[PDB]
Design a protein around this ligand. Sequence first.
Ligand SMILES: CC(C)(COP(=O)(O)OP(=O)(O)OC[C@H]1O[C@@H](n2cnc3c(N)ncnc32)[C@H](O)[C@@H]1OP(=O)(O)O)[C@@H](O)C(=O)NCCC(=O)NCCS
Ligand SMILES: CC(C)(COP(=O)(O)OP(=O)(O)OC[C@H]1O[C@@H](n2cnc3c(N)ncnc32)[C@H](O)[C@@H]1OP(=O)(O)O)[C@@H](O)C(=O)NCCC(=O)NCCS
Ligand SMILES: CC(C)(COP(=O)(O)OP(=O)(O)OC[C@H]1O[C@@H](n2cnc3c(N)ncnc32)[C@H](O)[C@@H]1OP(=O)(O)O)[C@@H](O)C(=O)NCCC(=O)NCCS
Lengths: 188, 188, 188
Amino acid sequence: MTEKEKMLAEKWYDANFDQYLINERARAKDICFELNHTRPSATNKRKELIDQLFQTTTDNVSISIPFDTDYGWNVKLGKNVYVNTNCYFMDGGQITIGDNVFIGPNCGFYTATHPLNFHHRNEGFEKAGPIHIGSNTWFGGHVAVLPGVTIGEGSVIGAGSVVTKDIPPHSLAVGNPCKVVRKIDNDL
Amino acid sequence: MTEKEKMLAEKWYDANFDQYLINERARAKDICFELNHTRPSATNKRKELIDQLFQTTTDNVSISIPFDTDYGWNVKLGKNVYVNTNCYFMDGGQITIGDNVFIGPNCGFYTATHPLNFHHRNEGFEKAGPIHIGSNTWFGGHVAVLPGVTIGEGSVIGAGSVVTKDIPPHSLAVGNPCKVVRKIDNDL
Amino acid sequence: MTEKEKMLAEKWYDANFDQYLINERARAKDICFELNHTRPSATNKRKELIDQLFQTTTDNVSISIPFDTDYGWNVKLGKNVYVNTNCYFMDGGQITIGDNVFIGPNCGFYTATHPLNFHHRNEGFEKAGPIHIGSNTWFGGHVAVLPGVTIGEGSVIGAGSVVTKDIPPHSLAVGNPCKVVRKIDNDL
Ligand SMILES: CC(C)(COP(=O)(O)OP(=O)(O)OC[C@H]1O[C@@H](n2cnc3c(N)ncnc32)[C@H](O)[C@@H]1OP(=O)(O)O)[C@@H](O)C(=O)NCCC(=O)NCCS
Ligand SMILES: CC(C)(COP(=O)(O)OP(=O)(O)OC[C@H]1O[C@@H](n2cnc3c(N)ncnc32)[C@H](O)[C@@H]1OP(=O)(O)O)[C@@H](O)C(=O)NCCC(=O)NCCS
Ligand SMILES: CC(C)(COP(=O)(O)OP(=O)(O)OC[C@H]1O[C@@H](n2cnc3c(N)ncnc32)[C@H](O)[C@@H]1OP(=O)(O)O)[C@@H](O)C(=O)NCCC(=O)NCCS
């Protein structure tokens, strides 16, 4: 397998020294830079950049600057997704975001693990753990979501949370580590 | 009431689809953008932008870039307020900052709540909870202050704190959630 | 002593009103601004700026934008140091970083303490507590490292950690406050 295929199959891959992945990260980063230096009221320019970054035709995806991602094409987005300032979608592992998602400022969605053993880590290896973000969710600011985590549909993550484990749907969860506090009444 | 008046009166308001608030947020964001792209040594330009953003004549308010706010005019500032890099004053609810305030880097002052019910939330409703920051205070970096929180005068908030409840004056408080650790001797 | 010499000797110094330190912070902040506004693929320009900022000839030090530091020359770097987006090396106290160091996004390395007494603090005084970062270390994103803290070689700091005390070598440590969870097998 290529190191890309490895990455996408949840296997250890050489994130650092693989030329194809290096170049793909460089593509995303230069688009992020342009976007981060595009005036917020330049609506069409920003939409075009966002669509180029994510390699998709977004439907009411609003990204406040600055924004960062590793690949861009490995973030799959629903409609009506509001991302406030200073978020980072580190998407070596796929980041799936549903519809009607409110993301607070300074949130990081982190799919990259490195080996704990420094000898393996220094050789460039990573393993990507996909993140799935349910539809109809809200994240407060300053949240980190760690590799492999799924947040169920209808759930609310409190500001400052570090989400180390999956959160069931219809749940209010807060803290470091993030723990479910109570169920949310999502009735019509 | 207009949605603005609702916002300012602590009532549920349509933050997302109200044109007047949309345009007011767009005003602030374009000023922030200009300020964030103004060389740090361009003293006068930065002061003029800051005064335009906050709609006031500031006295020794120093804002390190980047900075963000939603309205700008809903942040009321004392003199001698030092705001380090990457702070966000999300001021739908008023944010009152006293004199001689030191704000560390990456601090978020968050006044916005959304409904927990995703049906109400997806309709664009928010409720703003004012933040009051006492005079003679110090915030470490990476702090988040949540809606409705008052930090008393003379108090110190430790780096990484998530401040969910009011902090009494003359207090050292740290943690997630932030809790008072001890009293501070602020004697002359 | 000059206030610089005081700063570097772990004594209370006037950080705010000393002209020489003010001008040194202005040098670093204008280099950061240029760097933060240099296209990520402008490899040689970014290296020249990084070497100017740190006043050294770096060996495979890669800094993702944006980046911030107070002095630049008070950060001493090994080789193979990877710094992801939105870090702040607040280096009034020396920040020593070893070889083969992976630093996650939105990490703050904070050497500045202010007096707790608001009277002394408002007079501009600080005391700098050096940070030492071991070789062969990995920091997840959203980590704050507080003044005086040493992280031993071969150690891993989990995302969201607030590191208030020294962490021994060969350790996995996480949390707010950060606590050692287990030893890491770093064997060849
Ligand atoms: C969780 C949240 C939604 C508030 O929920 P809440 O249940 O009304 O808050 P409560 O008063 O019930 O707090 C319940 C307990 O949980 C704690 N708590 C609430 N939010 C917390 C958080 N984010 N982190 C840690 N603890 C938290 C409170 O300290 C409280 O402690 P107690 O056991 O002494 O009562 C809060 O994070 C919030 O407002 N988040 C969004 C803020 C924000 O980021 N806005 C910007 C994005 S729009
Ligand atoms: C709170 C602070 C001032 C340290 O204060 P301190 O007087 O050293 O407090 P202590 O170390 O006596 O605190 C006692 C306990 O609180 C804990 N603690 C201290 N700061 C903490 C924080 N920020 N978060 C969580 N726990 C903290 C310590 O781990 C200590 O644990 P113990 O039970 O093992 O003793 C620290 O947050 C700080 O320096 N903040 C500013 C650093 C910074 O952000 N600088 C950049 C902006 S200038
Ligand atoms: C700790 C970390 C490094 C991985 O370690 P890990 O082996 O999953 O941790 P463990 O499972 O041994 O730890 C056991 C406990 O620690 C908790 N934990 C793990 N990471 C944590 C974190 N960052 N903060 C708080 N708690 C954490 C778990 O909830 C678990 O609880 P339990 O034992 O009660 O179930 C995690 O932060 C991580 O994935 N870090 C990198 C993520 C990142 O930032 N990537 C971007 C930069 S590449």
